[model samples]
Target: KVFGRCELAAAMKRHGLDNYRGYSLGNWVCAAKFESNFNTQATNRNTDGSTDYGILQINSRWWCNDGRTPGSRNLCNIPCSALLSSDITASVNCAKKIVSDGNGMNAWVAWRNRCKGTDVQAWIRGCRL
Candidate 1:
């Protein structure tokens, strides 16, 4: 089962998006399907032995648990209460605001441009749900 969706939505809520709709969720799922194959805890091992983890394919080792400091990220750590909310809705919002400055579909556009084609560094650039 997918996991980051709840924590992602809550993270979006923390960023000021409260509506949480369906189309957005669909879009996110599309991006995520291409990214990590819907595995929240998915991890990719680099030739160097480092790894990427979580549903959104987050590189946890590169990020932080505090969610603060530039370049230092954190885990979603979804709580029981967030389960009441739609998982996709939350994850899309989270990915949107995280990738873009809440500026619209820039995140999606960037995702395809950076993640879909040849470049791999932007893998999470366009992630939605």
Candidate 2:
């Protein structure tokens, strides 16, 4: 489920991430571009025993349950594997829930590090919408 930039842009658009919670579509693109490199199956383990899963790099300790993180909140109430679905609906919903919980897009360290202070539009360039 590796996606090209425009393909990811289209999927994110379909999932209502455009300007969702006052964050621009560009911010989502930029963050995911770095976080998971647009790969739906990407995963990374953290030193704290948490793991980031899928395209959004959603964390098991907070957003989803991988059945491994010791104090996992499963705040999104979803299986961590769901984030790996190429369909992306589950991933989008969970990511939205993260923002609706008041973290906004800042929950993504990738976003705060670079996209936060830059013109993220560059990440969405060449996309049709």
Candidate 3:
């Protein structure tokens, strides 16, 4: 496991991710919670034969390489296994790259389906970030 809501919120704040790219810290918190439950070792095989990896659940189809999946774009240029680590710097940085690529947080289906247009403040409530 990576962090709980409070720890994740504080880390996000420390990393200056509170309002990055106009997306609130709550968005990140909610997405992370829903996607991987803060498990850095999380990996989910997708229906499309791709896989989601790490805290942000980044897809192999676009970001990382899982070795099993062929023809991956691997735009992030990092191995998918790298995302599944206790140190989330690489995963977080890759997520930033993904957002910078014009998808924004919409790159995450969890954010689009659960965090988008929702009251996500509770995700960071009680955190002293």
Using lDDT as the measure, which candidate wins? 2
lDDT digits (tens) for residues 1-129 of candidate 1:
454544444444454444333223334434555556665545565444344444444333333232222343444443312322334443443444455544443334434654444433232344442
Best-fitting candidate, scored by TM-score? 2
Give a tens-digit lDDT track for model 3, residues 13-127: 7776778888889999999999999988999998889999998899898899888776689999999999998877878788888878888999888899999999999899888
User: Which pairs clash in the backbone of model 3?
Assistant: none
Give the C-alpha miss distance for residue 125 in model 2, angstroms: 1.3
Clashing pairs in 2: none
Clashes of 3: 0
Local distance difference test scores for all models: 0.42, 0.91, 0.87
Reference-based TM-score of each model:
0.38, 0.95, 0.92
Which has the higher lDDT value, candidate number 1 or candidate number 3?
A: 3
User: What is candidate 1's CA lDDT for residue 27?
Assistant: 43
| Alpha carbon deviation, residue 105, candidate 2 (Å) | 1.3
